[model samples]
Target: HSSGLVPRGSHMTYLFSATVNLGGALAPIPLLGGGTRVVEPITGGTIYGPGFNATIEGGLAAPILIKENGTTSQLPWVYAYGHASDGSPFYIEEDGIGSSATQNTRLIIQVGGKYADLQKMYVLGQPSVNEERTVATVECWSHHH
Candidate 1:
C-alpha cells in the first residue's frame, strides 16, 4: 500500500548494541562561572552484536554537565578495545552527546580483517542509562536502500 509514495522513507537495519558499566559516580562540582560537572570512570562492559560481538575493555572518562537551567548534558569520548569471538582485535568508540533526554550518539567501530565491514562504520545510535545512571546500554542502526 503506497500513499503517493509518502516521501519515501529509508529502511533502518539494526547493527549492534553495547552496554558500558561505570566504575563509580563521582560527586558533582560547581563550574568555574556557573554550572555543574560530574565524572564517572568506565570500568568494563560487553558489546553483543547480532554477529560482531566482542569483549569491551574500558579506557575513557564519562563526564556530565548540568546547565544553570538545571538541564543536564553528557559529552564524553569513550574508547573501548575489544576482542572478537575468534580472537580478532577490534576498537570501538562511543563519542556522543545526550541531550533533551535523548541519549543519541555516534558509534565508531573498527574491525580489521574479515569483519572489516564495520571498520570505520558510522550509524545512528540510541543509548539508555539504568535507574542509578551507572550502566549505559546502547543500540545502533544504519540506513540502507
Candidate 2:
C-alpha cells in the first residue's frame, strides 16, 4: 500500500436479469466498417429482481453491426423497456465490441430510468452472450438525479 494511491474497495449490486427475444432473422444489410448490420425485433421477455418484476415490452428492437475484423457495434441502441412491479419504468441499452465468429465479446450496457422512489438512476451491466440471445448482470450504485 503506497499511502492510499488508489482506493482498495469497490462495490456492486445485483439488480436483475433480462432476456431479449429475437423474433426472427434481422436485416442483413452491410455497414461502413466492412460489417454487416442486423436488427432483431424484440418479441417478448421478462425482467425480475428484488422488489421488482415485469414483462419486457414489445416493438423494441436489438440491432448489431458486425465487422469483418471480428469487431462489432450495437445499432438501434435502445434494446428494450419495461415497468417494475411497483409500476416504475425502465429501459435497457447496449453498446460495445462483439464478434459472431467467436464466443468472445463484451457488451457495455446502460440500465436505468426511474423505479419506485428513485426518480433518476442508472446501472452498468456486464453481459454474457449466447446463440440468438444475451444475458447481463446489472451492477451499480443507485444515485438520485
Candidate 3:
C-alpha cells in the first residue's frame, strides 16, 4: 500500500539519456531584461533508449543566465529534434532548474513527440560531469503525458 502524490502502481521508467561534450569559445551576450547570457555549444553526443536512438547532428546550444544571487538558472524548454533508429522523427524537450547547493544541475525532460507510435512524456535527469563531457540519466513514468 502506498500513500503519496504518485498514484499507486506508478513507477519511474527509463526514458532516454545522453552524454554530451561542451566546447570552448563562450561569449557573454545582452538580453532584453538586462540579464547576462552564456552559451555552451554541444560539440557532439548521442541519445538512446527503448524504441529510440540517434547520433546528434549539428549542436546543442545551451543558453544559460546568471541570477542576481549568483546562482545560475537554466531556461526551461530547451529542445532537440532527430530521427530514431527506425528513421522516425522525434523531439526532446527539457525544463527545470540548476542552482543552489542541492538543486544544481538537475533537469526535467520530455523525451517524446509525434513520431509514429511514440508517446509524449516527461523525464527527470541530473548531469554528472566528466571532464568536458556531461552524462545524464533521463527517466520518466511508464504512463503517457
Candidate 4:
C-alpha cells in the first residue's frame, strides 16, 4: 500500500473481468444527462464524457489543521482518476482533513490511471490511442495547514 493502509490481516489479489453498460445498450456522453465531467489538470479545463462515479468514504469531512499549528488534525487519503488531455489516464492521491477544512491545497497527483484499479478512469475525445497527461487537481490541504 502506498499510504500503508492496505487493511491489516487482509490479502488482496488482482483479477480481470469484463462488464457492460446495462444502464443502456450504449454508454452516455460526459456532458449529457447525469454523466460526470472530468477536469483537466494542465489546462484546468473539462473533458466531456461519461465517467465512473467515485466516493470518499470514512474521511468525508476531516479538518485541515496541522500538528505544527497546535491542531491535532487527522488527515484521510483519497484516490481518484480521470482522463488526461493527451488521452492517457490520470490519478490523484490526496491527503486532507476535508474540503471544508482545506480550501485549495495539493496532496499528490500521478500519471497513469491504471496504477490503481480502485480509482475510476474514463477515455475522452475518442482518439483511440494511449497518451499521458495530468487529469485533475489533487489537494493535500485546502488551508495552509
Candidate that scores best on TM-score? 1
Clashing pairs in 1: none
Instruction: Rate residue 94 of model 4 by lDDT.
Output: 47
lDDT of 3 by residue, 1-145 (tens): 5687766655556555665555663677877866656555555567777644665543454555656677656553245555556565555555535344534233333234433444434445554445533432333233323
Q: What do the candidate models score in CA lDDT, each in turn?
A: 0.68, 0.49, 0.51, 0.29
TM-scores, all models, native as reference: 0.72, 0.58, 0.58, 0.24
In angstroms, the error of model 1 at 78 is: 2.3
The most accurate candidate by lDDT is: 1
* lDDT (C-alpha) at residue 33 in model 3: 68
What is the C-alpha lDDT profile of model 4 across 1-145, one tens digit per residue? Answer: 4557654553323221111111111222244323232222222223221222222211211222234445443343334445554455655444443344323223343454433333322211101101332222221111111
Lowest-sum lDDT 10-residue window in model 2: 136-145
Evaluated against the true structure, the overall lDDT of model 1 is 0.68
Task: Pick the winner on lDDT between candidates 2 and 4.
Answer: 2
Clashes of 4: 10
Provide the lowest-lDDT 10-residue window in model 3. Answer: 135-144
1 against 4, candidate with superior TM-score = 1
lDDT of 2 by residue, 4-94 (tens): 6664544344555666565665667776756666656666677666534667775444455655456554443436666656565555554
